[PDB]
A paper describes a structure:
The main pathway for ethanol production in C. thermocellum involves the bifunctional aldehyde-alcohol dehydrogenase (AdhE). AdhE functions in the anaerobic fermentation pathway and contains two domains: an aldehyde dehydrogenase (ALDH) domain for the reduction of acetyl-CoA to acetaldehyde and an alcohol dehydrogenase (ADH) domain to reduce acetaldehyde to ethanol. Both reduction processes natively use NADH as a cofactor and are reversible in the presence of NAD+ as a cofactor. Structurally, AdhE is an intriguing protein as it forms large, filamentous helical ultrastructures termed spirosomes, that could be necessary for function.
Using standard cryo-EM techniques, we were able to determine a 3.28 Å cryo-EM structure of the extended C. thermocellum AdhE spirosome. We determined that the native state of the C. thermocellum spirosome is extended (different from that of other structurally characterized AdhEs) and contains an enclosed channel between the ALDH and ADH active sites. The first is the buried area located between two molecules of AdhE, in a domain-swapped dimer interface, where one ALDH domain is sandwiched between the ADH and ALDH domains of the second protein. The second interface is between the dimer of dimers, here referred to as the tetramer interface. This interface has a much smaller interaction area because it only occurs between two ADH domains. However, the calculated buried surface area differs between the two E. coli dimer interfaces, but not the tetramer interface. Both the E. coli and C. thermocellum extended dimer interfaces bury ~5000 Å2. We found that more salt bridges form in the extended C. thermocellum structure as compared to the extended E. coli structure, which suggests that this may be a factor in the stability of the extended C. thermocellum structure that is not found in the E. coli structure. At the ADH active site, we observe an empty density in the C. thermocellum extended structure, coordinated between residues that have been implicated in the ADH activity of the protein (circled in red). We see that there is density, most probably a water molecule, being coordinated by H734, D844, and C846. While the channel can be found in both the compact and extended structures, we see that the channel in the compact conformation has areas that are exposed to the cytosol, whereas the extended channel is entirely enclosed.
Numbering used by the authors:
A (entry chain F), D (entry chain C): 465 to 532
B (entry chain E), C (entry chain D): 11 to 869
Write the structure that this text describes.
Amino acid sequence: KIYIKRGCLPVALDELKNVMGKKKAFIVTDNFLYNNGYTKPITDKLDEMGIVHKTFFDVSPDPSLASA
Amino acid sequence: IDNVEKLEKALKRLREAQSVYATYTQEQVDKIFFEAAMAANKMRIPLAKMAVEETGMGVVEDKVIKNHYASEYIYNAYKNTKTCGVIEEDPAFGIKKIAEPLGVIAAVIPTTNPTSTAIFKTLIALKTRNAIIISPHPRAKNSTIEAAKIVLEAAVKAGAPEGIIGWIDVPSLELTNLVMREADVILATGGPGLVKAAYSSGKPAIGVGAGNTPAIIDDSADIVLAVNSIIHSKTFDNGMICASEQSVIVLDGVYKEVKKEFEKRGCYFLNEDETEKVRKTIIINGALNAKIVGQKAHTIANLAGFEVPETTKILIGEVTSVDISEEFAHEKLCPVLAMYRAKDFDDALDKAERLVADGGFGHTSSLYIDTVTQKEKLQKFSERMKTCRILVNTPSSQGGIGDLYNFKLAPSLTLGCGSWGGNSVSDNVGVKHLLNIKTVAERRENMLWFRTPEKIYIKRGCLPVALDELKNVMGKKKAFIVTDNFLYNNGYTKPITDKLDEMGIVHKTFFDVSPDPSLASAKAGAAEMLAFQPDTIIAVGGGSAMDAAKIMWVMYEHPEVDFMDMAMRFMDIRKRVYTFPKMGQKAYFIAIPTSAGTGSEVTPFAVITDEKTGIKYPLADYELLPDMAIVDADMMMNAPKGLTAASGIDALTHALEAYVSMLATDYTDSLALRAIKMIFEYLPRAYENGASDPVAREKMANAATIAGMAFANAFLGVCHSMAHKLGAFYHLPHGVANALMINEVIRFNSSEAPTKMGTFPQYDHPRTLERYAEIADYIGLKGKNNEEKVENLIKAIDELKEKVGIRKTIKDYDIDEKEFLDRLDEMVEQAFDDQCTGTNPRYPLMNEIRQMYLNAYYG
Amino acid sequence: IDNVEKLEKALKRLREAQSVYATYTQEQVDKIFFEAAMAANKMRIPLAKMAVEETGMGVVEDKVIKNHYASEYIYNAYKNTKTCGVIEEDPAFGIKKIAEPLGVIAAVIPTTNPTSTAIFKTLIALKTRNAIIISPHPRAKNSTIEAAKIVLEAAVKAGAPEGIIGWIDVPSLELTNLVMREADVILATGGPGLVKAAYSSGKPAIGVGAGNTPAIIDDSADIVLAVNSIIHSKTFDNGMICASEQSVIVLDGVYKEVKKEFEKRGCYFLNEDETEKVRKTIIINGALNAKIVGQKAHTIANLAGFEVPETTKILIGEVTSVDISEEFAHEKLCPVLAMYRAKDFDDALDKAERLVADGGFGHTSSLYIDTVTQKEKLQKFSERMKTCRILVNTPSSQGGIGDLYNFKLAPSLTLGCGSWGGNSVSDNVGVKHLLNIKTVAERRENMLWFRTPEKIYIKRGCLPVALDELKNVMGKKKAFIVTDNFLYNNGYTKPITDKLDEMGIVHKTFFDVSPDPSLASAKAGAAEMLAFQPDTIIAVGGGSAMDAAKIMWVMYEHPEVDFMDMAMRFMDIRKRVYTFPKMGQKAYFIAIPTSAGTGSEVTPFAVITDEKTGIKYPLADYELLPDMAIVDADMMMNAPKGLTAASGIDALTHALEAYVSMLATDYTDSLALRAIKMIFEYLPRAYENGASDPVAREKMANAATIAGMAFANAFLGVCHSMAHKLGAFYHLPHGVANALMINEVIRFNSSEAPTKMGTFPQYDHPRTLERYAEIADYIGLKGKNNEEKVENLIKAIDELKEKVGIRKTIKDYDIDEKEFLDRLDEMVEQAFDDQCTGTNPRYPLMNEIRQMYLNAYYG
Amino acid sequence: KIYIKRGCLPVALDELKNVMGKKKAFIVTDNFLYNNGYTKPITDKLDEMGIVHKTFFDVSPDPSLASA
Ligand SMILES: [Fe+3]
Ligand SMILES: [Fe+3]
């Protein structure tokens, strides 16, 4: 399930509920990306469905074992 | 305004001023709204006094409360709403919603709320950059004009166009009917007989119904709360406001307590003579009396012909008849109330449903109940009642316009009733019903994908080492081999049967798969597996065997499936009407090919022919991917010359159509080009030398698998839609059927000006000639101007067909001409109705299909 | 069905079937929808062939596309949309929605889309549990009836009622008029005349408008994309589908390139004679020709009188005029096209607006632009175009029915054109337009609050310790003391100034505040504060001092505030029109009382008298809470006897009103009870002894502050509403005015059958008698049946008034009777229109207030 | 600003936007409450108002200094 073309993020994320039925999501991102709000569309989409999400942004470049 | 000509002049000036007001910003609208709200808020007492003096009905204090509500709660509700520009925006898509004013509104005003309704409507018209005509009632015109002037002066002082609000000085039927026919939208609140004209005026309208409001009191309820709420609601403004209780139904077990409380809190119960007098004085000639509305209970009693204590609040009459004959079942805007008795909750529900109909059908109803214990009764009441407002433990008069007792309910003085009441709102009319919503849409492209089966194994002699994965990473102990009779007879399952027997797996084999498999064989195989209870399904053989095994797997794991529903034409594979069931639980599928060019071990296609009509249905869904697609070259050696030629040509056609397809993405173009190069460079060597040249056979198998993936991710074109029918009508092999039509399709797709296009978001213009030129350049014909390259490619394909022993024309395959021309019409009709023609860049018509297929048959 | 009586019988059967259908569950409706979707999708080619053979215009393949669309895309837009029961559920409030069906739909089908529209309407009606009757066009009866049958015999087989779908076999004008008037809703397509009649019927109508569609092409756009999209949309189904590009506007920058691109791909540009012939053949007597719609360009040219190559697609004639007289400016349902030359973007917008307003007002328009580097032009286009659909870089025919080129747009025919075209839709008609939504509302209560100023300091001699915090903690530099003349002249501000001097803080004192503070004193104080710029404000004194200092603080922090706007009456303190500006930006507001019975150090109330009108304007908002209120008994040990008595009685009245308030809660109740007990126990000792009794003075201080808190959190009643006016009209002390009215107000409120009620959700039934009995029981009085207790309470209040030397009646304070009788009518009017009136647990009328005034005067 | 009576949580929380203007919220709660979805009424209103929020739910009975 490799998905291509623009604007495919919400359409691809539709499969989490309609086909798969998942309930809990754990976003792993970067502090630089999280501060500017690069996970905003994903969290907004997961809110449109009955999915609860938790974000973890304590990851640094050259990720060390402590963050893992 | 007392003449027609003045009316057109006023309408013209109002349209001119609205054309200016419609281009204001949010800040100016907020300023005007705030100033008008304050000006209307600080003049409640004089307006109420004027309304009471003019109409001669109602009480001053409740009118003051109504004015305060209509001037303050409206502002508190709609001060923070956005009604100017972009409301909703989704940058991922192209959607953009823009709010625009509605136009010039024509509003009518009743006598029940001469001033509060005018204030509310003027405020909501000012908020939405609209213009309004007020049509005052002939009996209460002065107060309405005064309220309109009060709002208008503040609006124009705040920086609004002068001619925003208009009004009719002396109203008449002709003037109102002319106003209604010219305005864009009509706001009707004047009751029936006028709302019907508004709806039959020829313009969009927003009207209101009204009528009887049943109230239910049952055993599990607070008697004091219910009685006092009913008294408050009924006595608010002498019951003149609509949406107030007109009848109360009390269950049998609490009748005495309710009657005692009603008597204690100051209500007078009528006896038979009093009931007769009251019911005779309420309705005159089948119509509500005009001198009884808004008057006190004492005045009603005096007019009826008797006397009551001066402190009586509600006249209550106990009745039994619910039909229209009873005169207490009618609506009445006065403190007279009717009381009913019920022996059970179902009887109360039946009674209340007769009282809502024929009266306030779709308006409102009330129920007093304990909402913690009696959960089922609440559901039953909610389901049964055909009213747009269902109130629980709330007074009806203040709950119909509810922002006082309940929140998240629109605070409106105009109450729609839905299709039940003969109007089109079904909600409290708010600020969102006076706006137009424009949708701006940007062109977006369809989402694509790239799906392949897992664990694709590519090397010689990999079959034993790969089959070692059983009982190593899994626990499969039962195998069901599906093969062909020819392969089974020559012992081609021996390398697999020996390997399975070496490990601890029992196996059963099925070898009743004829070429062009029939549905009966698939059903027999499914029944055999159902009797055998296998764990994994191994499909060995050519394309027909693998497709038949796929169908058997589908019928084995979901024995309730209907074949005719699966073979169903769809426009978009993601928007299928029929959804294939999930299939991964009862069996594990492995595909081992012996024929090369079919390439069905990496594709979702399972094309099979019918058992009765012999029609080829190409059913395809991504639930059919044969995971663990193993390719072994040593099993691919003993193929005769004809089979190799047909397989090679079929693989070449697969690669060509995958490259030129409309859904062809960049992830597949590389595979298509590589497969085309491989097939062109190595097919003759494998065809002539045979099994003595293992390199050619290995390269041909690899090219076939690559092209299989290529056309698995990108669907075919019209050549396959023609070749399927050609092979089903005259029993020709699939490869040679594809071979005889490729040149015509190449010449058909290559056209700068086609009659029809493919209708795809990303195929924005004909590009097929450039794609074929790219194919020619990659393969190395070195032509000129993108046209000679296509001709060179056609000539090269013809030469390749010559070198592999494919005859030039269909006529050379011993086909009678008369039967050909007799079946041509049916064959064209079936060819157009195929799944493969959907993704073709040109979308061929039937006449073009016939012309091309005749060209291919004649030369 | 070809006669009126047959139609009426059919309508009765339809209603009977819909009544049974309207109670189906979700699973059943899902099954009906699914089976109907298969039935409509399978028979896609036969219906297209039937329609093209019957109608005589159109192309078979595009009709097949439309038939496939109207089933597949409709099914996969609402397959899992909940529409049976509770769709919204908010447990915190009482809101719940039911989404009930609508009833009977009268469908009016056009001739351009006979089958697809019928399938779409039937499916959407089936999904919403409605019943539909179809009135086909006379020219295309059979195809529509056949499509309805194909859907119906599958819906019935799936488990649905029998006569859900009905149709009129032989349509007529009278039959259509009858079926429009007898149906619940009218869903109408087919352009003007029929929609005008549908809206002029008297029933809700959802109608379709139609008209032109201009396509703007500017300098910065893909020429190939724009040209090919326009060609595709225009040639789709020979252009009978609505919203097709009837004109094109191209700027001179790319005019020649666009012309070359059109010429390259199958188009014909007319000359002067051909344009004239085409103009004379499109329009006949100011109307569209019926023999030109749906045919190819070759046939149109043949009827015109010239010849064109058989492969031509579009005929284009260059025109400059854009008025109504031009025959190329109308909407043509044929492949004929008109080209316009525009100097710049503004000229193109002006022309497009003219085409939209003259013709397709509100339908749709198209723009081809670069959406990345032309934001301002795109925004101007979105703002100026008055069409419900605005498509950018999208073909109009496939863009209007949007599920192909843009998602998140409703896939549907039946496009509503909004109030611009004369129909109340302004959207794409879908499922949500065929439902009635019922609102279930449960009784909810307003939230309450407990707001007090921070840092309340309460002991004897705590003033120096409290003021020491001004430097060691906050760090202020400038102080502005406000007091009154008499309090200043006797040196009661000496300790404060001494402490400020010791701390080293510069201070300035303003003391020109007179009793009954006016606006002149407040303005002078604010001017002094502006000139001095203090960092903290210290308000020392009684009632006048705190109110004057609060007004000076407000005018000092926000000098643009109008006083007549803060003095406006509100129903809910949290829903008022005027919002107070935030305070505390500049200075603190420490408050030190020198009397007991005002409570102003803990309340948000202020009151001042205008100099000219001479009437008090109480105002209240929690932005006036004096932070760090200091209550020291040393500052107020030497008050005279009359002031002590008046203050004690005012505090007692505050506590009583706070207890019997509608907004009363436990927090205020405990404080009110304690204050009442302390006032009853210690007031005579303070009055008779004075400074010789410090314990009584301190207890009275604490009781006054506690009562202040109590009536700050819960508002007052009706005694203050008339006491303020009594004190203002005849110049009496506030406590004296309170004393003369509390006894009659207690009896007024104590009533089991009040004329009106306070209309507060928390106040279900009258309970003031029980509250007064609770007060009497807490004090220590004796009685029976909750009435003798209240009588004993009144007697005790009379005894307390007698002890502290307060007279019995108003007339005992030397007020003329003629003056009272000549000012009573104005005094009652002023008293009713007061802020304190709306909180009383018994809504007063004017006559009741006048009667209370007379009883107070005459005893 | 002590707020009482039932159904006052959304009305009180509305002040976070319509009065003050905050933009980031840090919810602190216990394991049991978070697992049983008792913070959902608050997070729903925060999402409706348009306020980013993050939840810490790692507190225990008789809390220690490590959790703080
Ligand atoms: Fe094939
Ligand atoms: Fe007071």
